[PDB]
Short mmCIF file of C-alpha atoms in Angstrom, two decimals:
data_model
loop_
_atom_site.label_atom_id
_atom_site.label_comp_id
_atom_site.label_asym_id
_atom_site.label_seq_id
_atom_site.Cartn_x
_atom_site.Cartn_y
_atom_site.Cartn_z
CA UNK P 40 91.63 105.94 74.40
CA UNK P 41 90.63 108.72 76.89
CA UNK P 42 93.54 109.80 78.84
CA UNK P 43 91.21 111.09 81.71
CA UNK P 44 90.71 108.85 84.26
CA UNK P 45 87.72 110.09 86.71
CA UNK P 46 88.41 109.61 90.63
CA UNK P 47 84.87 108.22 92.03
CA UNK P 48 85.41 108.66 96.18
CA UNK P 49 82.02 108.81 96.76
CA UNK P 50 81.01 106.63 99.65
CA UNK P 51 77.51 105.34 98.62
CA UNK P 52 77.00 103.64 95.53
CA UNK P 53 74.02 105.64 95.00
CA UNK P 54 76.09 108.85 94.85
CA UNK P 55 78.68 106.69 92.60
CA UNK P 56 75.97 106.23 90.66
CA UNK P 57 75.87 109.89 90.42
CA UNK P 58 79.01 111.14 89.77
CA UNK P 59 79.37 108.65 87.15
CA UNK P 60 75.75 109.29 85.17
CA UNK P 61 76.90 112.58 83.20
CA UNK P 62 80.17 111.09 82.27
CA UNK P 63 81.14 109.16 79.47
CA UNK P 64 83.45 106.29 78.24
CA UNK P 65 84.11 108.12 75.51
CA UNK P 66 86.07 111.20 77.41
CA UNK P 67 87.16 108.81 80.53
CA UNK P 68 88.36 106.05 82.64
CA UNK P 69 87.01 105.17 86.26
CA UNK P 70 89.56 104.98 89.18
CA UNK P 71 87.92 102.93 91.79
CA UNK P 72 89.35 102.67 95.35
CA UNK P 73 88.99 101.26 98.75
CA UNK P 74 85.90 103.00 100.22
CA UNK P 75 83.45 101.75 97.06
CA UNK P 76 85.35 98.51 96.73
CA UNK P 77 85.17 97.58 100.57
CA UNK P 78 81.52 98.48 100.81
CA UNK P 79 80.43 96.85 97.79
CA UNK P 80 83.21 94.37 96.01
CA UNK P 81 83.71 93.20 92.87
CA UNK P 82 79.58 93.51 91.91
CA UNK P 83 79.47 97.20 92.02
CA UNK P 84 82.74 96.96 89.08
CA UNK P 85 80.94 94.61 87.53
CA UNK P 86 78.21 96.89 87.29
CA UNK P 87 80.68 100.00 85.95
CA UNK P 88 82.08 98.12 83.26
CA UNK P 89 79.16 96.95 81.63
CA UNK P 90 78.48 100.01 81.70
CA UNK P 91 81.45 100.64 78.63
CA UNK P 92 83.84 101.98 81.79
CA UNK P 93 87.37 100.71 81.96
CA UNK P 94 88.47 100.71 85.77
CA UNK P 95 91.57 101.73 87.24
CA UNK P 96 90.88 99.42 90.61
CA UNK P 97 92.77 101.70 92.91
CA UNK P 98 93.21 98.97 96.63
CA UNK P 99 97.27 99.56 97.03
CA UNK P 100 98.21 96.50 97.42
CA UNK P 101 101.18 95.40 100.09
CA UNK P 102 101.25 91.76 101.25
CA UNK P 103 103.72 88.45 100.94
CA UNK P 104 104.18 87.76 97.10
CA UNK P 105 101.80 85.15 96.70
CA UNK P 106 98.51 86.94 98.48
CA UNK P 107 99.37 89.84 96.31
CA UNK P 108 99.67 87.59 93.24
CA UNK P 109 96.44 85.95 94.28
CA UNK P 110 94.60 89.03 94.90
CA UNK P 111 95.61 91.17 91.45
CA UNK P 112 94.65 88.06 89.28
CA UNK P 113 91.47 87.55 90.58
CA UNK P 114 91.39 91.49 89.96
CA UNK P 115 92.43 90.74 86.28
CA UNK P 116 90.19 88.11 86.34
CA UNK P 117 87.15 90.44 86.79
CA UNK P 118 88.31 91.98 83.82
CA UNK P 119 90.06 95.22 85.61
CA UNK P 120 92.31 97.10 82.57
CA UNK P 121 94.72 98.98 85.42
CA UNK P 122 95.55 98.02 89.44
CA UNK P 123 98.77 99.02 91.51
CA UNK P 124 100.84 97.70 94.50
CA UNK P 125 102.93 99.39 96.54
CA UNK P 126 106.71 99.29 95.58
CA UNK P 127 107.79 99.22 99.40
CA UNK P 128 106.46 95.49 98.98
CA UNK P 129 109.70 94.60 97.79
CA UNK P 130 110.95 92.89 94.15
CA UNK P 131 110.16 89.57 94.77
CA UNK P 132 106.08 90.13 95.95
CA UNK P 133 106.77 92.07 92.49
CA UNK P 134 107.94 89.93 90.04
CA UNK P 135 105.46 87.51 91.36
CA UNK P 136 102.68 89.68 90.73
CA UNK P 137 103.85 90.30 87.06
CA UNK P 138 104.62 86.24 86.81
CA UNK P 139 101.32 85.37 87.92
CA UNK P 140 99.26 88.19 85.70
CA UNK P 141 101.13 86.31 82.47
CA UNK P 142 99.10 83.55 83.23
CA UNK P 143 95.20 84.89 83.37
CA UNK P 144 92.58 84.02 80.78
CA UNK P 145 92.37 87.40 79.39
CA UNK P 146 94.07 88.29 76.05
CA UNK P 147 93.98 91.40 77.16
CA UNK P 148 96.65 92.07 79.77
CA UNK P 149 95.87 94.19 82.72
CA UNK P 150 98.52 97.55 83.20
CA UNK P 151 100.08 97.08 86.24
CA UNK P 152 101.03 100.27 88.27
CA UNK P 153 103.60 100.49 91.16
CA UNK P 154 103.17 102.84 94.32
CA UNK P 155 105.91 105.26 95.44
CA UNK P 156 105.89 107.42 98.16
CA UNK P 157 102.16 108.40 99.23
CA UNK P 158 101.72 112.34 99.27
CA UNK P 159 100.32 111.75 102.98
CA UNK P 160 103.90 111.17 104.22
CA UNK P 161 105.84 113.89 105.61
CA UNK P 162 109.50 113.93 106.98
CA UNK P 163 109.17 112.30 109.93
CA UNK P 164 107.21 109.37 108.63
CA UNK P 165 110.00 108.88 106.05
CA UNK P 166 112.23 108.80 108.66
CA UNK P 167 110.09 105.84 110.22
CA UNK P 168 110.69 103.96 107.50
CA UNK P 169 114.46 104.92 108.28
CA UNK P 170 114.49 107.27 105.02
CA UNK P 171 117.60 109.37 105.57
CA UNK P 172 117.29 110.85 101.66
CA UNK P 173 114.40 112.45 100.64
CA UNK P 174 111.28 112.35 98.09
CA UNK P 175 112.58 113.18 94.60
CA UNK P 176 115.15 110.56 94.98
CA UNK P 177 113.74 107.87 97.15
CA UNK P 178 110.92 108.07 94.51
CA UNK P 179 113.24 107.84 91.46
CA UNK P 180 114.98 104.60 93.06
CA UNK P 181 111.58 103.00 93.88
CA UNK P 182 110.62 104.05 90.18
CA UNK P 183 113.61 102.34 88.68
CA UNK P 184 113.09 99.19 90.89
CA UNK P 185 109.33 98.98 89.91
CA UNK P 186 110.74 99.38 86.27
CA UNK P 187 113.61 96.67 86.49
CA UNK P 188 110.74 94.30 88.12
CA UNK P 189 108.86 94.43 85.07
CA UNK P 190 105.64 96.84 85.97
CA UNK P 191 103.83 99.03 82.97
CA UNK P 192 104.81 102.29 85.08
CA UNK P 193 104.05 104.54 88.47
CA UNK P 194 101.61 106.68 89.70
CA UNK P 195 103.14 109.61 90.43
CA UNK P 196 102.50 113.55 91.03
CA UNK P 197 102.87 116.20 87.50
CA UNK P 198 106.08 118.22 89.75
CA UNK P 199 107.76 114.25 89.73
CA UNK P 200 106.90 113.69 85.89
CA UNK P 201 109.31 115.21 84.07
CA UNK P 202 111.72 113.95 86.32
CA UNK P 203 111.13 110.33 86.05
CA UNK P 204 110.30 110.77 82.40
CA UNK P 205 114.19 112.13 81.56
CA UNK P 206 114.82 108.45 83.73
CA UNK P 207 112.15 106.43 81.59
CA UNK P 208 111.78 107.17 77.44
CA UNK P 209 108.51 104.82 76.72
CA UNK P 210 107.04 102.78 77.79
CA UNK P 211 106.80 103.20 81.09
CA UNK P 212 103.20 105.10 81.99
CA UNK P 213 103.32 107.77 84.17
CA UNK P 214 99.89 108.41 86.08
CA UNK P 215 99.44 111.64 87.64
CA UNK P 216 96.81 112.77 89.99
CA UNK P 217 96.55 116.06 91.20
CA UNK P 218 95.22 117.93 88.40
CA UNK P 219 93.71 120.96 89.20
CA UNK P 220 92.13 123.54 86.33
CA UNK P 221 99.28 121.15 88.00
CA UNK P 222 96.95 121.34 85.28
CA UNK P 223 96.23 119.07 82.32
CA UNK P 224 97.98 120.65 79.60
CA UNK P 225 101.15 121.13 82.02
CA UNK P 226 101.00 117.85 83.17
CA UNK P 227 100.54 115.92 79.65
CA UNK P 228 103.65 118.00 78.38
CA UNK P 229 106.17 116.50 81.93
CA UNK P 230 105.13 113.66 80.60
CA UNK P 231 102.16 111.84 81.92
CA UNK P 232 100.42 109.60 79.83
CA UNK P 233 96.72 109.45 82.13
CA UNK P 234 95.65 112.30 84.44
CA UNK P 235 93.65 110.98 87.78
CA UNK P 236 91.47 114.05 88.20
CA UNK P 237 88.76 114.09 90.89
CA UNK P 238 86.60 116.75 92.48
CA UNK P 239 87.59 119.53 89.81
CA UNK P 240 85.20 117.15 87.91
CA UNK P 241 82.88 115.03 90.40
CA UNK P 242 82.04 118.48 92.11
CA UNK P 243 81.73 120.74 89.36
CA UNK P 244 78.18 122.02 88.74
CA UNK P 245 78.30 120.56 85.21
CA UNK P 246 80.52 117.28 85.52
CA UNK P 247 80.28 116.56 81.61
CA UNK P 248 80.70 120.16 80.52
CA UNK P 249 84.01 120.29 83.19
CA UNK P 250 85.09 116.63 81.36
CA UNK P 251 84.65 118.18 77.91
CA UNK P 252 86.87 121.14 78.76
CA UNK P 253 89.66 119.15 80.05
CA UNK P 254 89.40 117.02 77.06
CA UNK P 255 89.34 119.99 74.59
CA UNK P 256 92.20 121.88 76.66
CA UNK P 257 94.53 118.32 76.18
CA UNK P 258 93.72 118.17 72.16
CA UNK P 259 93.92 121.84 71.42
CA UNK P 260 96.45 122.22 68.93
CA UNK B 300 86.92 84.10 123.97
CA UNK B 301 89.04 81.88 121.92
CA UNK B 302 92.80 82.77 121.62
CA UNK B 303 93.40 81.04 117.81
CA UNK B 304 92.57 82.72 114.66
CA UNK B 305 92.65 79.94 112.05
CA UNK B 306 94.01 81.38 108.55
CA UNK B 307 91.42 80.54 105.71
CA UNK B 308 94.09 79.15 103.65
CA UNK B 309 92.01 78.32 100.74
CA UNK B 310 90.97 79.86 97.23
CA UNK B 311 87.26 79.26 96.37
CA UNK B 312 84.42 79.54 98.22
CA UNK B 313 83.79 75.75 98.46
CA UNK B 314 87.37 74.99 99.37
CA UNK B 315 86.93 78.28 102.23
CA UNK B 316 83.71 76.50 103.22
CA UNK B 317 85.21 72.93 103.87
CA UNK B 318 88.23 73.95 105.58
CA UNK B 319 85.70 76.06 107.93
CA UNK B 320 83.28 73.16 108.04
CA UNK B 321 85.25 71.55 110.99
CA UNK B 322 86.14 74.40 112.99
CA UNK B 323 84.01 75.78 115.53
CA UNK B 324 83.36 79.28 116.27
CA UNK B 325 83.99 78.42 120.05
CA UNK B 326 87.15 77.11 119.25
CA UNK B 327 88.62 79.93 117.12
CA UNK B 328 87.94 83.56 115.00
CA UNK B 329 88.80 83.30 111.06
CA UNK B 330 91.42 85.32 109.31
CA UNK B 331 89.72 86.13 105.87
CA UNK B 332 92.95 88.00 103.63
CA UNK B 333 93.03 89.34 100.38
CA UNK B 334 92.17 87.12 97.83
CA UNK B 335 89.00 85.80 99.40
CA UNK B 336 87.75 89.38 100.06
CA UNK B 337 88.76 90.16 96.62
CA UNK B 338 87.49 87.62 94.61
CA UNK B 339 84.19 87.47 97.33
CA UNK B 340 83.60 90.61 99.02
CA UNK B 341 81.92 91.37 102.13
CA UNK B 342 78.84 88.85 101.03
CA UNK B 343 81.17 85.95 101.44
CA UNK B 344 82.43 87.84 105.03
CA UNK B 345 78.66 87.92 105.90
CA UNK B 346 78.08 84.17 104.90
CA UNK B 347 81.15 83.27 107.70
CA UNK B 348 80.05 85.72 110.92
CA UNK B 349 76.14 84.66 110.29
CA UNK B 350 77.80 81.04 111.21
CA UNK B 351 78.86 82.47 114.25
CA UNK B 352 82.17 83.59 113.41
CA UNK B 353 84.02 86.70 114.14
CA UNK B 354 86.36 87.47 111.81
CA UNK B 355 90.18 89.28 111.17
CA UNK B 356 89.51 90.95 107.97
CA UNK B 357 93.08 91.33 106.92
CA UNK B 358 93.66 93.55 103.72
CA UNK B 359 96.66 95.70 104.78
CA UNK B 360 95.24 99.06 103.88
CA UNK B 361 97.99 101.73 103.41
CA UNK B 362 96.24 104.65 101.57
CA UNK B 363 95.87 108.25 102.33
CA UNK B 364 94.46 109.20 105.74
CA UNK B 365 90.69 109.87 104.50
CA UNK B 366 90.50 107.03 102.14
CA UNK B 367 91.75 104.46 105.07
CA UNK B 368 89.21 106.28 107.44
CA UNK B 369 86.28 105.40 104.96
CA UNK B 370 87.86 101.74 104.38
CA UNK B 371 87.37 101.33 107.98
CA UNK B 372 84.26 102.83 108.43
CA UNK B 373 83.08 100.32 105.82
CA UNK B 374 85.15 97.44 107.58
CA UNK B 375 83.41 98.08 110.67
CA UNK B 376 80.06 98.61 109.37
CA UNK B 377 80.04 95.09 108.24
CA UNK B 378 80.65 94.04 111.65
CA UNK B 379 83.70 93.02 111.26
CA UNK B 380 85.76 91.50 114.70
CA UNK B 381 89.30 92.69 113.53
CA UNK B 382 91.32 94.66 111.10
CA UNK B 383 94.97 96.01 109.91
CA UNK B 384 96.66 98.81 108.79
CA UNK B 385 100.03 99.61 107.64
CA UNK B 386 102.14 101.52 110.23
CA UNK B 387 104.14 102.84 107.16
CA UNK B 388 101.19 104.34 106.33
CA UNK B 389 102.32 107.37 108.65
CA UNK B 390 101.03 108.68 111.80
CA UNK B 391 98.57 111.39 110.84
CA UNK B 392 96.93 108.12 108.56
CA UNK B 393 97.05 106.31 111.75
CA UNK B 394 95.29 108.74 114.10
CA UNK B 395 92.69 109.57 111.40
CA UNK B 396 91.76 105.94 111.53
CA UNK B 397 91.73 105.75 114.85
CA UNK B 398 89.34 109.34 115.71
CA UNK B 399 86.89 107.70 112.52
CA UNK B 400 86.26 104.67 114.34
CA UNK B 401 85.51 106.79 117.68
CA UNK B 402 83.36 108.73 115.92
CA UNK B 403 81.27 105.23 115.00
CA UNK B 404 78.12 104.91 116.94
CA UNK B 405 78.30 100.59 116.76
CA UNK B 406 78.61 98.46 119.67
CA UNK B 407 81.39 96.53 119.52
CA UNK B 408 84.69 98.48 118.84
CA UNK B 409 86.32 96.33 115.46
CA UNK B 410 90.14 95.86 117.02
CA UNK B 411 92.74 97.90 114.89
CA UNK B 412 96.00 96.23 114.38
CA UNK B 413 99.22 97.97 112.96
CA UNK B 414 101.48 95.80 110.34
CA UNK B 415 105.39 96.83 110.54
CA UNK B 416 107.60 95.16 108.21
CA UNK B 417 106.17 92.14 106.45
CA UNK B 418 108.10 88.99 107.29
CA UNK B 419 108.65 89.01 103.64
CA UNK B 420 111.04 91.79 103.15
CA UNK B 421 114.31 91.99 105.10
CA UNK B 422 117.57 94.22 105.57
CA UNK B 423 118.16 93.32 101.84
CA UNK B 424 115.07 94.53 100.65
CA UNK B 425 115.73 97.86 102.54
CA UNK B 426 118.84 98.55 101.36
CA UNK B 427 117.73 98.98 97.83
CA UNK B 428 115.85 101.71 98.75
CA UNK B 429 118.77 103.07 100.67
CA UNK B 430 117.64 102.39 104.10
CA UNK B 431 120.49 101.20 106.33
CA UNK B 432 118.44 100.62 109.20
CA UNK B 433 118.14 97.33 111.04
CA UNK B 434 114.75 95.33 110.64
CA UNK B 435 114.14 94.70 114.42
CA UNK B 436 114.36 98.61 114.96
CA UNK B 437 112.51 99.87 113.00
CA UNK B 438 109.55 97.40 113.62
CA UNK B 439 110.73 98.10 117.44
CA UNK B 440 109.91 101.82 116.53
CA UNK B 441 106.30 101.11 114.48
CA UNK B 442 105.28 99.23 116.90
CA UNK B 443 106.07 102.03 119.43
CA UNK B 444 104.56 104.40 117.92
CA UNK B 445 100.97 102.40 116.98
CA UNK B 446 100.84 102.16 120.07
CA UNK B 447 101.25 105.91 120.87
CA UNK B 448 98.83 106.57 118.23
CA UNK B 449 96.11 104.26 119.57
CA UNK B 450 96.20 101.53 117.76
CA UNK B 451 95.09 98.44 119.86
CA UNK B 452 98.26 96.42 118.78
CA UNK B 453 100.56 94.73 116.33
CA UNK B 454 100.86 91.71 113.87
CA UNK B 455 104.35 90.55 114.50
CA UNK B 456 105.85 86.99 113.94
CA UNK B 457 105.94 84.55 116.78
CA UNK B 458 109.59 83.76 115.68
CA UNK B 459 109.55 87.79 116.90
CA UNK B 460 107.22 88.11 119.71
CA UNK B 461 109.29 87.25 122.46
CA UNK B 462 111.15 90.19 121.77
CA UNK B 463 108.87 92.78 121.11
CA UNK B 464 106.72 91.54 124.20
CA UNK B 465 109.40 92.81 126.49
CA UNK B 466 108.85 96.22 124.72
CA UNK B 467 104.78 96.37 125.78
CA UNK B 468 102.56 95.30 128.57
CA UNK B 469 99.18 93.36 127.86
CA UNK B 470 97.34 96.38 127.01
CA UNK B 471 98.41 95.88 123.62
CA UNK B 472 98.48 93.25 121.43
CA UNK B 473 100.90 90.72 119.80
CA UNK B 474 98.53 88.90 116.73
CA UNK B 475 101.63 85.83 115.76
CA UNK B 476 101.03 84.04 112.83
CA UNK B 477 104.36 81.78 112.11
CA UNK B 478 103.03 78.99 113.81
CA UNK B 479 103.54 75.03 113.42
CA UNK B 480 112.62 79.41 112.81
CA UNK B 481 110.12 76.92 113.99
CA UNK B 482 107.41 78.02 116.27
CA UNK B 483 105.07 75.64 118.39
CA UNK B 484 101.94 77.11 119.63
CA UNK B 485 103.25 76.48 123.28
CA UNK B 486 106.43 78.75 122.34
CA UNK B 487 104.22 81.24 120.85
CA UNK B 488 102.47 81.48 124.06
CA UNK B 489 105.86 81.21 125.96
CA UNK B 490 107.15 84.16 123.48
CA UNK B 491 104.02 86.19 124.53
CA UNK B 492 101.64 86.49 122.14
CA UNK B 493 97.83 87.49 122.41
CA UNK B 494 96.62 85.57 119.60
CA UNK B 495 97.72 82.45 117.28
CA UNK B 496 97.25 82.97 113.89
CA UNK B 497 97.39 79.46 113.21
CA UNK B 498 96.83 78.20 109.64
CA UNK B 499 98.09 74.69 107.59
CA UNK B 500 98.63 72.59 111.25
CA UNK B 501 95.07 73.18 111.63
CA UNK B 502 93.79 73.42 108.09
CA UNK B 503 95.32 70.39 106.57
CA UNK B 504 95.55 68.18 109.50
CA UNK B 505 93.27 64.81 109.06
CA UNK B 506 91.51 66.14 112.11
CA UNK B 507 91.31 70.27 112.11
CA UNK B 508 88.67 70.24 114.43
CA UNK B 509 91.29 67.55 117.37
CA UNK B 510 94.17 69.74 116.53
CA UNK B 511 92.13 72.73 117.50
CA UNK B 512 90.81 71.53 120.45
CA UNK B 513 94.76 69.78 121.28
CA UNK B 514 96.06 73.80 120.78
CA UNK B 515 93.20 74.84 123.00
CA UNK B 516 94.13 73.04 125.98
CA UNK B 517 97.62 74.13 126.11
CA UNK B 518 96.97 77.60 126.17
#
């Protein structure tokens, strides 16, 4: 069980196709997103898995309960081993979710993930959302909600890790991306369980040399 | 140009294709959500709009700025009529979306619609994550400031249009879904809305096809 999971952003699945050729299911995960999963659907993760890939299908979602329930089975259905929602979408679109995933035809339960605060929003969007408090904390509530509504964990960043990870003992997965080469080591030892690393690897001039490295640096000992 | 979008209620593609069987696309555009897309993809989008339909792809997005950008890009590279974002998303988000679909060298400009507060949270939802806030102000606010951002309008209930019309002229646009508390499609338009998202009375009525034209008529 790699605990690398490669960002693919690229926006053609010919570059995807890329990226992902040097790598190996053996060192990593996939995290697919929006851009790839927009442009091509559920085919092109069709595609990755048979390839030996799990996929972390990255879409965010924030809807009523019931079109996010319908939406992350058929997600689970396709045979998807992580996905997240936003936590803003409230407990009961929650609970829902985690309701509804009991009942797939998989033995193999997908992780479900839950959405803080995105890095993208600054002060004054908090305060949009009528945020008087700040980051740190309106993450840790968000955290404890996702927790209480039954979800396998968060994604959040390395500097929030060993925060939430004093708050939550095991198990409840932190996923961290960020990395840089926050770095691995650093980040495994605040307590993340998977690092989301992208371009340090996807544009390195050796991807598979850069993915061995990390891997190496995590295990050394 | 037909003021209903009828809301594909359904889960498979057979079930999607006979509820769409009776419509028309003179009559209304299709709101495709979700599920559909997810279970479908755009293949399944393509199917509907080479029938003649344009179509309200309506997946949310609330991502990082560059990520949403390329969603969109995609979104309106498949020729898609309409499309949503969440305001919470934050403004920089927002205005990236907006200068990437400027920067798109298609014909018709996809229409980008900002989501505020789902109807399915309320005060109580915000208070557990501390916010004190009132509902109808801060959706007042989002809405204000989509619009400041460039956004060509708003999803907001019809139970909630009337209002947040009297907050913007008909330069921007009030999508109401919420239609049969109860909201006729003649209060809707009363309320001022821009367009009925209209699903079940249409959908699951013996006739879809004489409700449609019956809502068509009022208008």
């Amino acid at each position: 069980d790699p605990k690398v999971i490669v960002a693919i952003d690229a926006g053609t699945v010919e570059q995807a196709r890329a990226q992902i050729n040097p790598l190996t299911p053996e060192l990593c995960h996939l995290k697919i997103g929006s851009i790839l999963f927009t442009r091509y659907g559920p085919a092109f993760v069709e595609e990755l898995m048979q390839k030996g890939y799990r996929i972390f299908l990255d879409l965010k979602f924030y809807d009523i309960p019931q079109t996010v329930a319908g939406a992350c089975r058929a997600v689970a259905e396709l045979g998807v081993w992580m996905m997240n929602i936003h936590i803003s979408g409230g407990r009961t679109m929650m609970e829902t979710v985690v309701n509804a995933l009991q009942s797939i035809t998989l033995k193999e339960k997908p992780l479900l993930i839950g959405v803080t605060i995105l890095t993208s929003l600054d002060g004054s969007d908090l305060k949009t959302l009528g945020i008087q408090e700040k980051v740190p904390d309106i993450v840790c509530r968000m955290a404890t909600l996702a927790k209480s509504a039954g979800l396998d964990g968060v994604v959040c960043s390395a500097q929030e890790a060993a925060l939430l990870r004093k708050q939550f003992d095991r198990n409840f997965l932190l996923v961290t991306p960020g990395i840089r080469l926050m770095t691995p080591r650093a980040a495994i030892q605040a307590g993340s369980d998977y690092l989301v690393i992208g371009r340090p690897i996807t544009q390195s001039t050796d991807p598979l040399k850069a993915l061995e490295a990390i891997d190496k640096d995590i295990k050394t000992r």
